[PDB]
Amino acid sequence: YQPCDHPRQPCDSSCPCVIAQNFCEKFCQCSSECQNRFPGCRCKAQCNTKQCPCYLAVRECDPDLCLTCGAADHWDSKNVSCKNCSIQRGSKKHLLLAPSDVAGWGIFIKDPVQKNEFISEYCGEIISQDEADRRGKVKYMCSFLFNLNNDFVVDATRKGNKIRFANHSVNPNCYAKVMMVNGDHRIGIFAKRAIQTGEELFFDYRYS
Ligand SMILES: [Zn+2]
Ligand SMILES: [Zn+2]
Ligand SMILES: [Zn+2]
Ligand SMILES: [Zn+2]
Ligand SMILES: [Zn+2]
Ligand SMILES: [Zn+2]
């Protein structure tokens, strides 16, 4: 997002964040106490349903703001209380790269997953469709990209992780969410429906 910077002035009717109806983010130059900043949550635990303000706003919990859910207990890795810090923590479901049951190379999940559960971060560079076109004109052995939306693309060619091998389908069982993660947009992969162990993962490359 576009950070605001209006020294010695609050984030009022003249602040571009307030005008564009967006929260001020980590890199905005307003006070830490800016009323237009995201308040975080005060959940008991989990943070993986619409009852969590962070989850509802497509944001991971912030260790400096989400002080009660377990987001600040960053040293813990087992049966974690906040289920909305996985991208930050580098946690993912166990995945297997193997020949696809359809064709080429595929991804198989090794843990059962519920509808809308987080699977893995999809690593890569978020680039504009203009930079994606520029790259596609001029290359590597094999490139890995998908469309996030009408303006942005994720290129996993230079900075990807295993999940980049998950095949395309117009009837996918996975989807991507562009999420706010400690001031940065990062891509999360979630189950579209409940998936059982051993199932091949697919997502729609046209849009997610
Ligand atoms: Zn502002
Ligand atoms: Zn701002
Ligand atoms: Zn502000
Ligand atoms: Zn929460
Ligand atoms: Zn939170
Ligand atoms: Zn949380």
Numbering used by the authors: 520 to 657, 660 to 729
How does the study describe this entry?
Enhancer of zeste homolog 2 (EZH2) is the catalytic component of polycomb repressive complex 2 (PRC2), an epigenetic regulator of stem cell pluripotency, and expression of tissue-specific genes involved in cellular differentiation and developmental programs.. EZH2 carries out a key function of the PRC2 complex, namely the sequential mono-, di- and trimethylation of Lysine 27 of histone H3 (H3K27) within chromatin. EZH2 contains a C-terminal SET-domain, a conserved feature of histone lysine methyltransferases. The catalytic activity of EZH2 requires the presence of at least two other members of the PRC2 complex, namely embryonic ectoderm development (EED) and suppressor of zeste 12 (SUZ12).
We crystallized and solved the 2.0 Å structure of the C-terminus of EZH2 (residues 520-746). Clear electron density was observed for the CXC, SET, and I-SET domains, and the first 5 residues of the post-SET domain. However, the 17 C-terminal residues including most of the post-SET domain were not observed. The cofactor SAM, present in the crystallization buffer, was also absent from the structure. First, immediately N-terminal to the SET domain, a unique CXC domain, coordinated by 2 clusters of three zinc ions, differentiates EZH2 from other SET-domain PMT structures (no structural homolog of the CXC domains was found by the DALI server). Second, the conformation of the first five residues of the post-SET domain diverges drastically from previous structures of active SET-domain methyltransferases, and folds in a direction diametrically opposite to its expected position, where it would otherwise contribute to formation of the cofactor binding site. Importantly, within the crystal lattice, each CXC domain interacts with a neighboring protein partially occupying both the SAM binding site and the region in which the post-SET domain is expected to reside. Thus, the conformation observed in our structure is not compatible with SAM binding and therefore reflects an inactive enzyme. The EZH2 structure reveals the opposite conformational state that could have similar consequences: a shift in the I-SET domain brings it in close proximity (2.9 Å) to the first 5 residues of the post-SET domain, effectively eliminating the peptide binding groove and sealing the entrance of the substrate lysine channel. Superimposition of our EZH2 structure with that of another SET-domain methyltransferase, EHMT1/GLP, in complex with SAH and a dimethylated H3K9 peptide confirms previous homology models showing that Y641 is perfectly positioned to engage in a hydrogen-bond with the de-protonated ε-nitrogen of the substrate lysine, thereby restraining the rotational freedom of the di-methylated nitrogen atom, and disfavoring alignment of the lone pair with the scissile bond of the cofactor’s sulfonium group, necessary for the displacement of a third methyl group.
